[PDB]
Design a protein around this ligand. Structure first.
Ligand SMILES: *[C@@H]1O[C@H](CO)[C@@H](O[C@@H]2O[C@H](CO)[C@@H](O[C@H]3O[C@H](CO)[C@@H](O)[C@H](O[C@H]4O[C@H](CO)[C@@H](O)[C@H](O)[C@@H]4O)[C@@H]3O)[C@H](O)[C@H]2NC(C)=O)[C@H](O)[C@H]1NC(C)=O
Ligand SMILES: *[C@@H]1O[C@H](CO[C@H]2O[C@@H](C)[C@@H](O)[C@@H](O)[C@@H]2O)[C@@H](O[C@H]2O[C@H](CO)[C@@H](O)[C@H](O)[C@H]2NC(C)=O)[C@H](O)[C@H]1NC(C)=O
Ligand SMILES: *[C@@H]1O[C@H](CO)[C@@H](O)[C@H](O)[C@H]1NC(C)=O
Ligand code: NA
Ligand code: NA
Length: 259
Protein backbone atom coordinates (compact mmCIF):
# COMPACT_ATOMS: atom_id res chain seq x y z
CA UNK A 1 0.00 0.00 0.00
CA UNK A 2 1.68 3.12 -1.45
CA UNK A 3 -0.33 6.38 -1.69
CA UNK A 4 -0.95 8.74 -4.59
CA UNK A 5 -0.34 11.62 -2.19
CA UNK A 6 -3.82 13.06 -2.78
CA UNK A 7 -7.23 13.01 -1.05
CA UNK A 8 -10.85 14.07 -1.75
CA UNK A 9 -11.79 13.49 1.92
CA UNK A 10 -14.86 11.57 0.79
CA UNK A 11 -13.35 8.57 2.62
CA UNK A 12 -11.66 8.90 6.03
CA UNK A 13 -8.29 10.72 5.59
CA UNK A 14 -6.27 7.81 6.88
CA UNK A 15 -7.46 6.10 3.66
CA UNK A 16 -5.16 8.51 1.82
CA UNK A 17 -2.30 7.87 4.25
CA UNK A 18 -2.82 11.33 5.68
CA UNK A 19 -2.10 11.67 9.38
CA UNK A 20 -2.13 14.19 12.24
CA UNK A 21 0.12 15.08 15.20
CA UNK A 22 -0.39 14.42 18.87
CA UNK A 23 2.62 16.60 19.68
CA UNK A 24 0.79 19.84 18.98
CA UNK A 25 -2.28 21.75 20.15
CA UNK A 26 -5.24 20.11 18.41
CA UNK A 27 -6.50 18.27 15.34
CA UNK A 28 -8.16 19.07 12.02
CA UNK A 29 -11.74 17.93 11.84
CA UNK A 30 -13.14 15.99 8.82
CA UNK A 31 -16.52 17.29 7.61
CA UNK A 32 -19.10 16.50 4.89
CA UNK A 33 -21.88 19.07 4.45
CA UNK A 34 -23.84 16.71 2.16
CA UNK A 35 -24.13 14.08 4.95
CA UNK A 36 -24.53 16.51 7.85
CA UNK A 37 -25.57 20.02 6.62
CA UNK A 38 -24.97 23.36 8.36
CA UNK A 39 -26.80 26.70 8.25
CA UNK A 40 -23.55 28.48 9.25
CA UNK A 41 -23.04 31.40 6.79
CA UNK A 42 -19.23 31.18 7.02
CA UNK A 43 -19.18 27.46 6.45
CA UNK A 44 -18.17 26.14 3.02
CA UNK A 45 -19.80 23.11 1.32
CA UNK A 46 -18.76 19.55 0.52
CA UNK A 47 -16.19 17.26 2.08
CA UNK A 48 -13.11 18.76 3.68
CA UNK A 49 -10.66 19.14 6.55
CA UNK A 50 -11.67 21.95 8.82
CA UNK A 51 -10.15 24.05 11.54
CA UNK A 52 -12.89 25.57 13.73
CA UNK A 53 -11.15 28.49 15.43
CA UNK A 54 -13.98 29.33 17.86
CA UNK A 55 -12.71 29.55 21.46
CA UNK A 56 -9.16 28.79 20.37
CA UNK A 57 -6.48 31.25 21.60
CA UNK A 58 -3.77 32.79 19.38
CA UNK A 59 -0.68 30.59 18.89
CA UNK A 60 -2.44 27.21 18.58
CA UNK A 61 -0.90 24.84 16.05
CA UNK A 62 -2.46 21.89 14.10
CA UNK A 63 -0.76 19.74 11.44
CA UNK A 64 -2.33 17.64 8.61
CA UNK A 65 0.56 15.49 7.21
CA UNK A 66 0.56 13.93 3.72
CA UNK A 67 2.00 10.47 3.16
CA UNK A 68 5.69 10.36 2.25
CA UNK A 69 5.94 10.67 -1.52
CA UNK A 70 8.60 8.83 -3.53
CA UNK A 71 8.07 9.99 -7.07
CA UNK A 72 9.98 9.16 -10.21
CA UNK A 73 8.33 11.53 -12.69
CA UNK A 74 8.22 15.28 -12.34
CA UNK A 75 4.79 15.84 -10.72
CA UNK A 76 2.50 18.48 -9.19
CA UNK A 77 0.77 18.96 -5.85
CA UNK A 78 -2.22 21.21 -5.81
CA UNK A 79 -4.60 21.79 -2.92
CA UNK A 80 -7.85 23.82 -2.82
CA UNK A 81 -8.41 26.01 0.28
CA UNK A 82 -11.08 28.15 2.02
CA UNK A 83 -11.06 30.75 4.79
CA UNK A 84 -13.95 32.48 6.54
CA UNK A 85 -14.49 34.64 9.59
CA UNK A 86 -17.40 36.30 11.41
CA UNK A 87 -15.15 39.30 12.09
CA UNK A 88 -13.81 40.98 8.97
CA UNK A 89 -10.57 39.49 10.47
CA UNK A 90 -8.55 36.28 9.96
CA UNK A 91 -9.09 33.07 12.01
CA UNK A 92 -5.51 31.89 11.47
CA UNK A 93 -2.35 31.56 9.37
CA UNK A 94 -2.00 28.58 7.05
CA UNK A 95 1.50 27.22 6.46
CA UNK A 96 2.82 24.45 4.12
CA UNK A 97 6.07 22.63 5.02
CA UNK A 98 8.21 20.07 3.26
CA UNK A 99 10.57 17.75 5.06
CA UNK A 100 12.75 15.76 2.74
CA UNK A 101 14.17 12.34 3.61
CA UNK A 102 12.87 12.66 7.16
CA UNK A 103 14.76 15.90 7.77
CA UNK A 104 14.03 18.91 9.95
CA UNK A 105 10.69 20.68 9.43
CA UNK A 106 12.39 23.84 8.19
CA UNK A 107 10.35 26.93 7.31
CA UNK A 108 6.99 27.21 5.56
CA UNK A 109 7.63 26.94 1.88
CA UNK A 110 4.21 28.53 1.25
CA UNK A 111 1.86 30.51 3.44
CA UNK A 112 -1.23 32.71 3.47
CA UNK A 113 -1.84 35.20 6.26
CA UNK A 114 -5.38 33.81 6.08
CA UNK A 115 -7.42 36.87 5.06
CA UNK A 116 -11.14 35.82 5.43
CA UNK A 117 -12.63 36.00 1.91
CA UNK A 118 -14.79 32.88 2.06
CA UNK A 119 -13.78 31.76 -1.42
CA UNK A 120 -11.72 28.84 -2.57
CA UNK A 121 -8.26 29.37 -3.99
CA UNK A 122 -5.89 26.93 -5.71
CA UNK A 123 -2.20 26.75 -4.82
CA UNK A 124 0.25 24.36 -6.48
CA UNK A 125 3.52 22.95 -5.18
CA UNK A 126 6.46 21.99 -7.43
CA UNK A 127 8.91 19.94 -5.37
CA UNK A 128 12.09 18.50 -6.99
CA UNK A 129 12.64 15.46 -4.78
CA UNK A 130 12.48 12.05 -6.30
CA UNK A 131 12.90 8.33 -5.69
CA UNK A 132 14.85 6.89 -4.04
CA UNK A 133 14.38 10.06 -1.93
CA UNK A 134 11.08 11.29 -0.48
CA UNK A 135 9.27 14.18 1.04
CA UNK A 136 6.32 14.93 3.23
CA UNK A 137 3.91 17.81 2.81
CA UNK A 138 2.64 19.22 6.11
CA UNK A 139 -0.33 21.57 6.42
CA UNK A 140 -0.13 23.66 9.55
CA UNK A 141 -2.79 26.07 10.81
CA UNK A 142 -1.77 28.53 13.52
CA UNK A 143 -4.73 30.40 15.12
CA UNK A 144 -5.05 34.18 15.26
CA UNK A 145 -7.32 34.20 18.29
CA UNK A 146 -10.42 35.35 16.37
CA UNK A 147 -13.19 32.97 15.34
CA UNK A 148 -13.71 31.39 11.91
CA UNK A 149 -12.81 28.56 9.52
CA UNK A 150 -9.90 27.38 7.42
CA UNK A 151 -10.60 24.38 5.19
CA UNK A 152 -8.93 22.18 2.57
CA UNK A 153 -11.45 20.36 0.36
CA UNK A 154 -9.06 18.44 -1.88
CA UNK A 155 -5.40 17.69 -2.51
CA UNK A 156 -4.45 16.34 -6.01
CA UNK A 157 -1.10 14.87 -7.05
CA UNK A 158 -0.70 15.03 -10.81
CA UNK A 159 2.01 13.35 -12.90
CA UNK A 160 3.05 16.41 -14.91
CA UNK A 161 4.82 19.75 -14.32
CA UNK A 162 2.87 22.40 -12.55
CA UNK A 163 1.05 24.82 -14.86
CA UNK A 164 1.29 27.98 -12.77
CA UNK A 165 4.73 27.28 -11.31
CA UNK A 166 8.08 26.55 -12.92
CA UNK A 167 9.97 23.54 -11.51
CA UNK A 168 13.71 23.49 -10.79
CA UNK A 169 16.41 21.19 -12.07
CA UNK A 170 18.77 19.31 -9.82
CA UNK A 171 21.23 21.83 -8.40
CA UNK A 172 24.74 20.78 -7.52
CA UNK A 173 26.68 21.52 -4.34
CA UNK A 174 29.03 24.49 -4.52
CA UNK A 175 32.69 24.48 -3.47
CA UNK A 176 35.09 27.46 -3.02
CA UNK A 177 38.12 28.70 -1.00
CA UNK A 178 37.91 31.91 1.13
CA UNK A 179 37.34 35.61 0.24
CA UNK A 180 35.56 34.99 -3.11
CA UNK A 181 31.88 34.80 -4.22
CA UNK A 182 29.87 31.58 -4.28
CA UNK A 183 27.29 31.39 -7.10
CA UNK A 184 24.13 29.31 -7.03
CA UNK A 185 22.58 28.66 -10.40
CA UNK A 186 18.95 27.93 -9.81
CA UNK A 187 17.97 26.56 -13.20
CA UNK A 188 14.26 26.13 -13.96
CA UNK A 189 11.83 24.96 -16.58
CA UNK A 190 8.80 27.15 -17.15
CA UNK A 191 8.00 30.86 -17.24
CA UNK A 192 8.64 33.67 -14.74
CA UNK A 193 6.99 37.05 -14.68
CA UNK A 194 7.13 40.30 -12.72
CA UNK A 195 5.40 39.63 -9.38
CA UNK A 196 7.18 36.31 -8.92
CA UNK A 197 9.58 36.20 -5.99
CA UNK A 198 12.77 34.18 -6.35
CA UNK A 199 15.14 33.27 -3.59
CA UNK A 200 17.79 31.02 -2.20
CA UNK A 201 16.99 29.95 1.32
CA UNK A 202 19.70 28.60 3.57
CA UNK A 203 19.03 27.14 6.99
CA UNK A 204 20.60 29.14 9.84
CA UNK A 205 22.12 31.46 7.18
CA UNK A 206 21.12 34.95 5.92
CA UNK A 207 19.60 34.47 2.45
CA UNK A 208 21.81 35.06 -0.56
CA UNK A 209 20.45 37.92 -2.74
CA UNK A 210 18.93 37.31 -6.12
CA UNK A 211 21.79 38.51 -8.34
CA UNK A 212 20.07 38.06 -11.73
CA UNK A 213 17.38 36.21 -13.69
CA UNK A 214 18.60 35.19 -17.06
CA UNK A 215 15.85 33.95 -19.39
CA UNK A 216 17.09 31.72 -22.22
CA UNK A 217 13.82 30.69 -23.86
CA UNK A 218 10.06 30.64 -23.24
CA UNK A 219 10.50 27.57 -21.14
CA UNK A 220 13.90 28.03 -19.51
CA UNK A 221 15.46 30.50 -17.07
CA UNK A 222 18.26 30.49 -14.51
CA UNK A 223 18.11 32.48 -11.30
CA UNK A 224 21.51 33.14 -9.79
CA UNK A 225 22.31 34.04 -6.17
CA UNK A 226 25.69 35.20 -4.89
CA UNK A 227 27.20 34.71 -1.47
CA UNK A 228 30.10 37.19 -1.64
CA UNK A 229 33.52 37.12 0.15
CA UNK A 230 32.81 33.65 1.70
CA UNK A 231 33.96 32.20 5.06
CA UNK A 232 33.39 29.13 7.28
CA UNK A 233 30.45 30.82 9.02
CA UNK A 234 28.77 30.60 5.60
CA UNK A 235 28.66 26.78 5.07
CA UNK A 236 25.29 24.95 5.05
CA UNK A 237 22.32 23.71 2.96
CA UNK A 238 20.72 25.89 0.26
CA UNK A 239 17.57 25.53 -1.82
CA UNK A 240 16.03 27.24 -4.84
CA UNK A 241 12.67 28.80 -4.26
CA UNK A 242 10.18 30.43 -6.55
CA UNK A 243 6.86 31.89 -5.46
CA UNK A 244 4.42 32.76 -8.23
CA UNK A 245 0.83 33.96 -8.14
CA UNK A 246 -0.08 30.28 -8.44
CA UNK A 247 2.28 28.16 -6.41
CA UNK A 248 5.73 27.51 -5.05
CA UNK A 249 8.49 25.46 -6.65
CA UNK A 250 11.49 24.13 -4.79
CA UNK A 251 14.75 22.51 -5.93
CA UNK A 252 16.62 19.89 -4.03
CA UNK A 253 18.98 21.06 -1.31
CA UNK A 254 22.40 22.02 -2.58
CA UNK A 255 25.25 22.19 -0.08
CA UNK A 256 28.04 24.77 0.33
CA UNK A 257 31.66 23.78 0.94
CA UNK A 258 34.43 26.23 1.92
CA UNK A 259 38.18 25.56 1.62
C1 LIG B 1 -17.42 25.88 15.73
O1 LIG B 1 -17.24 26.03 17.13
C2 LIG B 1 -18.32 26.52 17.91
C3 LIG B 1 -17.86 26.37 19.37
O2 LIG B 1 -17.61 25.01 19.70
C4 LIG B 1 -19.68 25.82 17.65
O3 LIG B 1 -20.76 26.61 18.13
C5 LIG B 1 -21.58 25.90 19.08
O4 LIG B 1 -22.61 25.19 18.42
C6 LIG B 1 -23.56 24.53 19.25
C7 LIG B 1 -24.51 23.84 18.26
O5 LIG B 1 -24.80 22.51 18.66
C8 LIG B 1 -24.31 25.51 20.19
O6 LIG B 1 -24.84 24.94 21.39
C9 LIG B 1 -25.97 24.03 21.29
O7 LIG B 1 -25.66 22.87 22.05
C10 LIG B 1 -26.13 22.91 23.39
C11 LIG B 1 -25.41 21.83 24.20
O8 LIG B 1 -25.88 20.55 23.85
C12 LIG B 1 -27.67 22.77 23.39
O9 LIG B 1 -28.24 23.24 24.60
C13 LIG B 1 -28.29 23.51 22.18
O10 LIG B 1 -28.56 22.62 21.07
C14 LIG B 1 -29.67 21.66 21.13
O11 LIG B 1 -29.42 20.43 21.86
C15 LIG B 1 -30.22 20.12 23.01
C16 LIG B 1 -29.84 18.73 23.54
O12 LIG B 1 -28.46 18.49 23.41
C17 LIG B 1 -31.74 20.21 22.78
O13 LIG B 1 -32.43 20.40 24.00
C18 LIG B 1 -32.17 21.30 21.77
O14 LIG B 1 -32.70 20.67 20.62
C19 LIG B 1 -31.06 22.30 21.40
O15 LIG B 1 -31.44 23.10 20.29
C20 LIG B 1 -27.32 24.64 21.74
O16 LIG B 1 -27.89 25.49 20.76
C21 LIG B 1 -23.41 26.61 20.79
O17 LIG B 1 -24.18 27.78 21.05
C22 LIG B 1 -22.12 26.97 20.03
N1 LIG B 1 -21.12 27.28 21.02
C23 LIG B 1 -20.55 28.48 21.09
C24 LIG B 1 -19.68 28.75 22.28
O18 LIG B 1 -20.72 29.34 20.23
C25 LIG B 1 -19.93 25.59 16.16
O19 LIG B 1 -20.99 24.66 16.00
C26 LIG B 1 -18.70 25.08 15.43
N2 LIG B 1 -19.02 25.09 14.02
C27 LIG B 1 -19.30 23.96 13.37
C28 LIG B 1 -20.50 23.97 12.46
O20 LIG B 1 -18.62 22.94 13.49
C1 LIG C 1 9.83 4.63 -8.87
O1 LIG C 1 10.77 3.87 -9.60
C2 LIG C 1 11.48 2.84 -8.94
C3 LIG C 1 12.40 2.33 -10.04
O2 LIG C 1 12.68 0.96 -9.93
C4 LIG C 1 12.28 0.18 -11.09
O3 LIG C 1 10.88 0.00 -11.24
C5 LIG C 1 10.51 -1.02 -12.17
C6 LIG C 1 8.99 -0.93 -12.39
C7 LIG C 1 11.26 -0.90 -13.51
O4 LIG C 1 10.63 0.07 -14.32
C8 LIG C 1 12.73 -0.51 -13.33
O5 LIG C 1 13.31 -0.22 -14.59
C9 LIG C 1 12.84 0.70 -12.41
O6 LIG C 1 14.15 1.19 -12.26
C10 LIG C 1 10.50 1.78 -8.41
O7 LIG C 1 11.15 0.81 -7.60
C11 LIG C 1 10.53 -0.53 -7.55
O8 LIG C 1 10.69 -1.38 -8.69
C12 LIG C 1 9.86 -2.56 -8.73
C13 LIG C 1 8.41 -2.25 -9.14
O9 LIG C 1 7.68 -1.66 -8.08
C14 LIG C 1 9.87 -3.31 -7.39
O10 LIG C 1 9.83 -4.71 -7.57
C15 LIG C 1 11.07 -2.83 -6.56
O11 LIG C 1 11.15 -3.57 -5.36
C16 LIG C 1 10.91 -1.32 -6.27
N1 LIG C 1 12.06 -0.77 -5.54
C17 LIG C 1 13.32 -0.65 -5.97
C18 LIG C 1 14.19 0.17 -5.07
O12 LIG C 1 13.77 -1.14 -7.01
C19 LIG C 1 9.38 2.45 -7.63
O13 LIG C 1 8.40 1.47 -7.43
C20 LIG C 1 8.76 3.64 -8.37
N2 LIG C 1 7.76 4.26 -7.52
C21 LIG C 1 6.63 4.81 -7.99
C22 LIG C 1 5.39 3.96 -8.08
O14 LIG C 1 6.60 5.98 -8.35
C1 LIG D 1 4.78 33.97 4.22
O1 LIG D 1 4.11 34.49 3.09
C2 LIG D 1 4.22 35.89 2.88
C3 LIG D 1 3.26 36.24 1.75
O2 LIG D 1 1.96 35.95 2.25
C4 LIG D 1 5.71 36.18 2.70
O3 LIG D 1 6.05 37.45 2.18
C5 LIG D 1 6.23 35.96 4.11
O4 LIG D 1 7.49 36.52 4.35
C6 LIG D 1 6.23 34.45 4.21
N1 LIG D 1 6.96 33.93 5.35
C7 LIG D 1 7.52 32.71 5.31
C8 LIG D 1 8.48 32.43 4.17
O5 LIG D 1 7.27 31.86 6.17
NA1 NA E 1 -2.76 17.49 14.98
NA1 NA F 1 -13.65 17.11 -0.96
Amino acid sequence: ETFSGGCLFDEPYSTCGYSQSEGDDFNWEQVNTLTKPTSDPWMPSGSFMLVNASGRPEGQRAHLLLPQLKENDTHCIDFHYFVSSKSNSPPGLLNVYVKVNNGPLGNPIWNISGDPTRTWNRAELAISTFWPNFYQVIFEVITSGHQGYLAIDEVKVLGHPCTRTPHFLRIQNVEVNAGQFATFQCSAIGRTVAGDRLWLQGIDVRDAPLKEIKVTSSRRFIASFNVVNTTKRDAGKYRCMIRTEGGVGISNYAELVVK
